[PDB]
Amino acid sequence: KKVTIFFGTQTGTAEGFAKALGEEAKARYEKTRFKIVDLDDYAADDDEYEEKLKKEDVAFFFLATYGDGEPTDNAARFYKWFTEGNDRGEWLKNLKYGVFGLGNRQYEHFNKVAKVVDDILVEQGAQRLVQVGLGDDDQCIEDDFTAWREALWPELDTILYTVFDAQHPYKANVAVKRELHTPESDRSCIHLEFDIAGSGLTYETGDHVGVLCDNLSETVDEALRLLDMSPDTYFSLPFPPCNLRTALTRYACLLSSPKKSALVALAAHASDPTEAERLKHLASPAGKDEYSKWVVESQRSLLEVMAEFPSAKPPLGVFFAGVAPRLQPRFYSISSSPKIAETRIHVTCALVYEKMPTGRIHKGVCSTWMKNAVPYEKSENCSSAPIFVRQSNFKLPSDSKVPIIMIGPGTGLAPFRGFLQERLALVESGVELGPSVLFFGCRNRRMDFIYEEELQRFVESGALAELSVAFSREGPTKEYVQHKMMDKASDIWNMISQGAYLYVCGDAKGMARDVHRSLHTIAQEQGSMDSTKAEGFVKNLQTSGRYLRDVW
Numbered sequence: 001k002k003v004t005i006f007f008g009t010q011t012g013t014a015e016g017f018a019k020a021l022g023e024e025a026k027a028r029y030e031k032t033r034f035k036i037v038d039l040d041d042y043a044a045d046d047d048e049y050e051e052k053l054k055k056e057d058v059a060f061f062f063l064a065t066y067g068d069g070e071p072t073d074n075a076a077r078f079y080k081w082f083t084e085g086n087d088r089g090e091w092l093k094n095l096k097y098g099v100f101g102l103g104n105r106q107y108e109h110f111n112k113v114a115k116v117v118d119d120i121l122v123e124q125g126a127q128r129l130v131q132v133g134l135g136d137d138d139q140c141i142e143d144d145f146t147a148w149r150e151a152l153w154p155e156l157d158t159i160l161y162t163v164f165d166a167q168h169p170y171k172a173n174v175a176v177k178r179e180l181h182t183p184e185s186d187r188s189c190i191h192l193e194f195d196i197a198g199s200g201l202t203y204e205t206g207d208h209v210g211v212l213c214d215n216l217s218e219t220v221d222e223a224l225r226l227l228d229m230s231p232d233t234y235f236s237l238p239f240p241p242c243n244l245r246t247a248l249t250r251y252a253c254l255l256s257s258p259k260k261s262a263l264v265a266l267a268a269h270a271s272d273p274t275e276a277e278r279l280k281h282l283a284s285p286a287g288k289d290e291y292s293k294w295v296v297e298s299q300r301s302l303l304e305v306m307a308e309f310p311s312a313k314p315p316l317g318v319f320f321a322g323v324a325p326r327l328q329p330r331f332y333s334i335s336s337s338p339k340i341a342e343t344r345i346h347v348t349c350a351l352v353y354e355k356m357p358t359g360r361i362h363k364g365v366c367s368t369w370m371k372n373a374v375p376y377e378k379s380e381n382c383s384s385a386p387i388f389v390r391q392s393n394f395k396l397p398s399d400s401k402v403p404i405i406m407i408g409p410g411t412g413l414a415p416f417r418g419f420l421q422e423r424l425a426l427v428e429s430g431v432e433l434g435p436s437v438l439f440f441g442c443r444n445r446r447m448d449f450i451y452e453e454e455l456q457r458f459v460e461s462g463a464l465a466e467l468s469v470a471f472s473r474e475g476p477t478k479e480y481v482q483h484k485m486m487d488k489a490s491d492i493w494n495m496i497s498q499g500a501y502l503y504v505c506g507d508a509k510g511m512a513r514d515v516h517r518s519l520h521t522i523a524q525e526q527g528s529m530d531s532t533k534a535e536g537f538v539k540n541l542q543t544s545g546r547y548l549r550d551v552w
């Protein structure tokens with residue numbers, strides 16, 4: 001019998017509990033083999049989650065809930081596969097499980113993520129070993145952990161041609177690199193095309209493309225200063241061996257905020273006892289509000305923190321394990337369709353450039369690379385990058401007559417450009433299209449209306465029926481996609497009634513929530529149902545697979 005322990009965490013508490021449970025369960029049942037898994041590492045795509053989760057015997061889930069009841073970033077992909085378009089009957093009958101939830105009762109959606117995953121698991125056949133844990137952070141979450149653990153043992157005691165992917169990427173030339181905003185814009189959105197002619201690399205409309213990126217050299221220089229060793233230091237340690245400068249450039253996530261366990265790791269190698277104690281304090285329960293404020297809210301990079309604690313000098317083995325997380329690929333919603341762009345993968349990338357609360361100037365590692373990438377046109381020598389394709393569920397209905405409702409302001413437009421290229425190639429070939437509507441949004445006609453002429457052409461060909469555009473900064477007044485949806489509330493409801501698919505893409509924190517509320521509001525007023533029923537209605541659309549979100 002196996003035991004796998006999954007975690008979804010941001011600051012590291014859920015991960016700490018998962019390590020703790022494993023260590024202690026290994027004491028009790030010294031024969032059975034355990035495994036601690038980050039949910040993002042567990043599977044590359046949905047097909048992989050499926051093939052793996054069925055082979056499970058015992059599984060514990062440590063899920064922390066964030067912003068408006070959503071999953072952490074490292075579990076968002078697992079969460080979407082498991083809770084949306086998720087009607088798969090009882091396929092987990094061989095599974096034994098328990099889920100402890102990391103939450104905070106001060107929030108509207110207390111332990112939402114843990115509750116949702118827990119309910120579905122039993123609905124789909126798996127067997128509860130323990131009731132769902134409901135730890136809240138405004139009280140003592142550790143105390144709820146031990147109670148949950150104590151509840152678990154009684155039941156646990158009597159139970160115990162190439163594939164291109166992130167490890168083998170394809171090296172693609174940058175064929176096209178183009179600013180989508182006008183010169184007047186204070187921001188930037190890059191249109192970029194990767195050349196895949198002859199590669200064997202394949203993609204579908206709505207898939208994602210992963211791009212491997214290096215830290216900027218300014219970032220590496222500073223990390224080199226803090227570690228205080230030569231750039232050419234060779235070391236053991238699981239990425240392939242290289243010098244220190246290379247490791248920092250390619251495998252070290254340096255600009256993210258340190259998890260509590262990273263603070264603990266630094267503290268074990270801090271020379272000054274008051275620095276060791278302060279780091280430990282910041283990692284401890286007593287230092288929780290300090291951690292939340294000084295680290296998480298201020299968005300302090302690892303490099304800032306290490307600078308504040310000059311005596312923390314971790315060995316390279318510790319630094320590349322528990323201090324600096326692995327540098328991740330960045331994913332982009334492919335903004336082309338294979339039927340039009342057969343030999344190129346199109347990308348729509350917003351430049352990340354922001355002043356952090358500390359005054360630190362953050363340049364996005366990947367988007368800054370794309371901003372500076374050299375295309376064929378200017379080329380004597382173009383840029384290139386290692387890429388791979390990841391399948392997703394953000395797909396057009398098989399039946400092109402089914403109505404489609406697309407909501408994507410800003411960069412959220414990306415995969416819809418792919419939706420429209422695909423529909424365009426369909427309609428040029430005789431296939432009939434059903435109704436279509438796109439809610440788009442930007443700041444200003446004279447700055448921000450990306451792909452404006454292509455959108456005109458899509459209306460012009462019948463790939464898209466109507467285009468609605470919301471302008472947030474053209475003068476005194478301010479409109480958003482929420483307001484345009486409300487104006488067309490009746491049309492939207494009628495489309496849902498006729499079986500429409502709903503798609504939302506773009507900003508997760510702001511837009512997606514407001515768009516979500518509007519659907520509930522539309523369902524209540526156009527559907528003549530109270531608030532509770534409409535939430536039932538909207539949730540039904542999600543589990544059915546007719547309300548799809550690609551947000552970040």
Ligand SMILES: Cc1cc2nc3c(=O)[nH]c(=O)nc-3n(C[C@H](O)[C@H](O)[C@H](O)COP(=O)(O)OP(=O)(O)OC[C@H]3O[C@@H](n4cnc5c(N)ncnc54)[C@H](O)[C@@H]3O)c2cc1C
Pocket residue numbers: 208255256257299300301330331332333334348349350351352354356362363364365366367368411414415550551552
């Ligand atoms: C499924 C999916 C699809 C996506 N599709 C697109 C797309 O089509 N187009 C697009 O432009 N992007 C898309 N994204 C987002 C994209 O993958 C990248 O996150 C984005 O490009 C930023 O990458 P970066 O390396 O340039 O910036 P990063 O360096 O990764 O920075 C990202 C953000 O983190 C913030 N940040 C900086 N420091 C901290 C800190 N210490 N603590 C907390 N936060 C901090 C930054 O201000 C910044 O906003 C998608 C993401 C996902 C998951």
Ligand SMILES: Cc1cc2nc3c(=O)[nH]c(=O)nc-3n(C[C@H](O)[C@H](O)[C@H](O)COP(=O)(O)O)c2cc1C
Pocket residue numbers: 008009010011012013014015064065066067068069070072102103104105107108109110111112137141
């Ligand atoms: C921005 C933010 C939003 C949060 N939102 C919720 C929430 O909606 N519901 C909830 O129960 N807890 C919420 N919490 C509480 C966290 O789940 C709690 O801090 C948790 O213990 C953190 O887990 P982690 O350290 O593994 O990331 C939120 C915390 C933060 C910082």
